[PDB]
Design an enzyme around this catalytic site. Structure first.
Site, short mmCIF file in Angstrom:
data_model
loop_
_atom_site.label_atom_id
_atom_site.label_comp_id
_atom_site.label_asym_id
_atom_site.label_seq_id
_atom_site.Cartn_x
_atom_site.Cartn_y
_atom_site.Cartn_z
N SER A 98 118.64 24.17 -6.31
CA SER A 98 116.96 23.81 -6.64
C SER A 98 115.86 24.76 -6.49
CB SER A 98 116.95 22.61 -6.90
OG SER A 98 115.85 22.03 -7.56
N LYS A 99 114.45 24.52 -7.33
CA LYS A 99 113.47 24.89 -7.90
C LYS A 99 112.59 24.23 -6.55
CE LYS A 99 114.20 26.19 -12.66
NZ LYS A 99 114.96 25.67 -12.62
#
Ligand SMILES: [Cl-]
Length: 485
Positions: A259-260
């Site tokens: 994930s970012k």
């Protein structure tokens, strides 16, 4: 197998957030494949969302590539034949294309509301959760004229061809979407603003991209893109459909994409800790590719020489910090000491971890720790004992090493050290070995542990004698004297 392909590839990130390592992996794969084949690497900024987009993020993407040493052939700053290279600047190009598509009947104005689509599904006994119905393909001139006359603002949709939408993916193999499964899709919003579904394939066509190498999470866009590329060839705007190569998604600990929101995805978190470009490039290269089965340590020139998209695997690409750290450490050890010293000084100085040694002394200390760290930042904990305000005798080390027996060792070393004529590592060594080994017949661990704890604060430190030399006589003597209490 045999002529080298004619290659024009892109790296087309959106300027939202920080540079995601999956996206930087994709940049590198594109860059390496261009350089392998003497092709052209195009850098395009996909910034058609003012809400999410930012100039901070744009500048950071340029910085990310430059720091990694990945120069671009066409794009921002450098220009090129097919510019400008920020999509926010190509509004007039998109309008022209839309107009042309509309006048050939490749695209059409669509006026349906989602509620009218849903109602048509219900009347036909179709799943009303299904999507667009292609209703507006078949509007009469009068009905079209009549919608405008009511102030309906249409969207532009592309008219899907009747056949299968299929390609041979350079990584994934054959993929096919069946005739009719893909609804006519919107190329604009009702404001007239073009969507990704127009601007991405449109610029790939207009920038004459030959190979699209992108993460496999975007694979589902490909049929829609194929359709649009075909339309663009019919209206004389493009010539050839690009090949597509979908790269393995970069994962975190499980089956899920990294994930970012996860700090491990941020290229610059790694920078800040003290990854060097050579370390991180090597690591990111291993996220879908591999130079050899018998080793994974390599530089950029070696990658350029070896990299082909045919060797990209679709196996799970899990990000592994331990592996990344290990490669970084190898790369650190591969640097020439002068290079390493300059990088290390700058890293420590610019993270408010100045080491209290003059330039030549610091070079000497850097040389001592080049083989002891995984990342540049680790040198602070190893070297901060040179700073009087950071030095502290670890209480567990003290209890173990600075008892009466160790106290006795310090007494002897202190008298030893006063006879040292010049304060250098060999003379320090000789004085202490004369006294503690030749003299007191002490075991080395016994002779030196108290002096290491006293001078450095800890039982593990850089080479003791060298460390004493760089601390200087006055400091070394002071610490040794205080340590016996
Ligand atoms: Cl990815």
């Amino acid at each position: 197998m045999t002529a080298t392909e004619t290659v024009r590839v892109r790296f087309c990130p959106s300027p939202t957030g920080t540079p995601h390592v999956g996206l930087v992996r994709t940049a590198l794969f594109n860059w390496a494949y261009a350089r392998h084949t003497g092709g052209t690497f195009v850098f395009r900024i996909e910034d058609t969302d003012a809400q999410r987009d930012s100039e901070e993020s744009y500048l950071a993407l340029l910085d990310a590539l430059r720091w990694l040493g990945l120069d671009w052939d066409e794009g921002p700053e450098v220009g090129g034949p097919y510019g400008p290279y920020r999509q926010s600047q190509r509004a007039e190009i998109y309008r022209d294309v839309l107009a042309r598509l509309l006048a050939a009947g490749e695209a059409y104005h669509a006026f349906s509301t989602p509620e009218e689509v849903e109602a048509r599904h219900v009347a036909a006994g179709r799943n009303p959760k299904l999507g667009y119905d292609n209703f507006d393909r078949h509007l009469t001139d009068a009905q079209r004229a009549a919608y405008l006359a009511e102030g309906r603002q249409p969207v532009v949709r592309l008219r899907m061809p009747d056949d299968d939408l299929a390609w041979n993916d350079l990584v994934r193999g054959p993929v096919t979407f069946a005739a009719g499964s893909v609804p006519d899709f919107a190329l604009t919003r009702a404001s007239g603003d073009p969507l990704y579904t127009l601007v991405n394939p449109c610029d790939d066509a207009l920038m004459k991209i030959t190979h699209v190498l992108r993460g496999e999470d975007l694979l589902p866009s490909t049929p829609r893109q194929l359709a649009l590329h075909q339309a663009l060839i019919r209206i004389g705007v493009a010539e050839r459909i690009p090949k597509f190569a979908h790269l393995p998604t970069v994962l975190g600990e499980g089956t899920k994409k990294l994930s970012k929101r996860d700090p491990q995805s941020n290229l610059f978190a790694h920078r800040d800790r003290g990854f060097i470009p050579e370390g991180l490039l090597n690591y990111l290269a291993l996220l879908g590719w591999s130079i050899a089965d018998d080793h994974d340590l390599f530089g950029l020139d070696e990658m350029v020489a070896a990299f082909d998209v045919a060797d990209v695997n679709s196996s799970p690409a899990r990000f592994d910090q331990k592996k990344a750290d290990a490669l970084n450490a190898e790369h650190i050890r591969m640097l020439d000491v002068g290079d390493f010293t300059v990088r290390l000084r700058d890293h420590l100085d610019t993270h408010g971890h100045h080491i209290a040694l003059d330039e030549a002394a610091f070079a000497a200390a850097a040389e001592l720790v080049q083989t002891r760290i995984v990342v540049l930042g680790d040198a602070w904990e190893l070297l901060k004992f040179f700073n009087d305000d950071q030095y502290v005798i670890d209480p567990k080390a003290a209890a173990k090493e600075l008892g009466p027996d160790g106290a006795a060792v310090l007494d002897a070393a202190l008298a030893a050290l006063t006879s040292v004529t010049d304060w250098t590592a060999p003379l320090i060594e000789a004085a202490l070995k004369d006294a503690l080994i030749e003299g007191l017949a002490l075991k080395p661990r016994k002779a030196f542990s108290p002096i290491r704890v006293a001078a450095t604060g800890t039982t593990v430190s850089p080479p003791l004698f060298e460390s004493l030399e760089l601390l200087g006589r006055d400091r070394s003597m002071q610490r040794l004297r205080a340590a016996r209490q």
